């Protein structure tokens, strides 16, 4: 394979986020192991699983898990790792809990000890401290990532990689402008990976199928690449997408071709997104009829 990791997000458990706790099968749904198997057979080896902190550990993040939501997270993780692929456990929470900024590193560390304890023996689990920190204090983002690492390792989960995320929605293109302080994170296992996201539409929000230009992806990750190299760090693109059109196709392959010549720092890339409730979503990687599964996956072949 070209990269250490190449795969897809498996979205759904974080859906309908305005309904807390919400109802499984009505507001949210978990990934389908059968279609995960199909993506595994195509050569993908990493699957990132968004979920809501409030659904896994309700009311207070220092409390006990919700049995039913945890049982389905466990089932999803095991469905991925039993085959030999990596499962990224992603509290898809934007640095916020019940829509308030998480300002207690100690509370966050307890949450992460609770979560890591469920997976501590599984070396194919990857812990992702939180999805897309944004519009919050830059020192707090550093300290939350460090508290997560401390909680994870305190649970005896020492074999696993930890994906840390930065401010500005962990964007690659904005990384050096705001996230330099993230270089000081420490891990006794030395398995920190800096997870950045990069979309290709004009404002980088990943909501339009139109890409700025055929080179916009490779352009948007060059300064992040040099930041990783200058600081002796490793990175991954944890979310990326583009529409099913010629300009985006070229932007996607140009970005991945650049990463492929910079694997001293880039460990790989994760598409946004697959999952069973995307329907006609412009970026759906869900077999067998998602638009990206049909029209984008053929151009990802050389990286599988």
Ligand X SMILES: OC[C@H]1O[C@@H](O[C@H]2[C@H](O)[C@@H](O)[C@H](O[C@H]3[C@H](O)[C@@H](O)[C@H](O[C@H]4[C@H](O)[C@@H](O)[C@H](O[C@H]5[C@H](O)[C@@H](O)[C@H](O)O[C@@H]5CO)O[C@@H]4CO)O[C@@H]3CO)O[C@@H]2CO)[C@H](O)[C@@H](O)[C@@H]1O
Q: Residue 228 Cβ, how far from ligand X at the closest point, in Å? A: 21
Cβ closest to ligand X, residue 1 vs residue 26: 26
Rule CB under 6 A: say whether 15 interacts with ligand X: yes
Closest residue to ligand X, Cβ-based? 16
Query: What residues contact 273, with CB distance under 8 A and at least 6 apart?
Result: 8, 9, 10, 11, 239, 241, 281, 283, 284, 285
Question: Can residue 284 be called a binding residue for ligand X (CB under 6 A)?
Answer: no
Please tell me whether residue 175 binds ligand X under the rule CB under 6 A.
Answer: no
The pattern of x and - marking residues 65 through 94 that bind ligand X according to CB under 6 A reads: ------------------------------
**Minimum separation from the CB atom of position 130 to ligand X (A):** 12
**Is 123 near ligand X (CB under 6 A)?**
no
Pairing type for strands 125-128 and 162-165 reads: parallel
Give the tokens for residue 66.
Answer: 């919700």
Q: Which is nearer to ligand X, 36 or 120 (CB)?
A: 36
Least gap, CB of 75 to ligand X (angstroms): 19
Q: Should residue 96 be labelled a site residue for ligand X when binding is judged by CB under 6 A?
A: no
Asked if 10 is part of the footprint of ligand X (rule: CB under 6 A), the reply reads: no
Among 99-107, 147-155, 205-213, 259-267, which window interacts with ligand X (CB under 6 A)?
205-213
Q: According to CB under 6 A, which one of 10, 165, 201, 239 is a site residue for ligand X?
A: 239
The neighbouring-strand residues paired with 290 are: none
- Report the nearest approach of ligand X to the CB of residue 190 (Å): 28
Q: Supply the minimum distance, in Å, between the C-beta of residue 211 and ligand X.
A: 15
Q: Please, which residue, 131 or 145, has the CB nearer to ligand X? A: 131
Q: Which of 3, 5, 10, 11 binds ligand X (CB under 6 A)?
A: 11
Closer by beta carbon to ligand X, 15 or else 266? 15
Task: Name the site residues for ligand X (rule: CB under 6 A).
Answer: 11, 14-17, 26-27, 50, 132, 205-207, 239, 272, 277-279, 281
């Amino acid at each position: 394979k070209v990269f250490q990791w190449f795969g897809s997000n498996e979205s759904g458990a974080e859906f309908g986020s305005q309904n807390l706790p919400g109802v499984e099968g009505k507001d949210y749904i978990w990934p389908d192991p059968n279609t995960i198997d199909t993506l595994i057979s195509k050569g993908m080896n990493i699957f990132r699983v968004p979920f809501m902190m409030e659904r896994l550990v309700p009311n207070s993040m220092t409390g006990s898990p919700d049995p039913n939501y945890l049982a389905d997270l466990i089932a999803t993780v095991n469905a991925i790792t039993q085959k030999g692929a990596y499962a990224v456990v992603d509290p898809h929470n934007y640095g916020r809990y019940y829509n308030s900024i998480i300002s207690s590193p100690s509370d966050f560390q307890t949450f992460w000890k609770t979560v890591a304890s469920q997976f501590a023996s599984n070396p194919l689990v990857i812990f992702d401290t939180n999805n897309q920190y944004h519009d919050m204090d830059q020192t707090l983002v550093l300290n939350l990532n460090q508290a997560a690492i401390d909680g994870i390792r305190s649970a005896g989960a020492t074999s696993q990689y930890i994906f840390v995320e930065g401010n500005s929605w962990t964007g690659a293109w904005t990384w050096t402008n705001v996230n330099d302080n993230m270089k000081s994170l420490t891990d006794p296992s030395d398995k920190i990976i800096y997870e950045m996201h990069q979309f290709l539409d004009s404002d980088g929000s990943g909501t339009s199928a139109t890409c700025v230009s055929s080179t916009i992806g490779q352009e948007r990750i060059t300064s992040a690449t040099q930041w990783l190299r200058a600081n002796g760090k490793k990175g991954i693109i944890g979310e990326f997408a583009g529409g099913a059109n010629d300009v985006c196709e070229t932007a996607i392959t140009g970005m991945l071709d650049y990463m492929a010549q910079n694997t001293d720092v880039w460990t790989g890339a994760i598409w946004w997104a697959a999952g069973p409730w995307w329907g006609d979503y412009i970026f759906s990687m869900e077999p067998d009829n998602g638009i990206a599964y049909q029209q984008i996956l053929p151009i990802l072949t050389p990286y599988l």
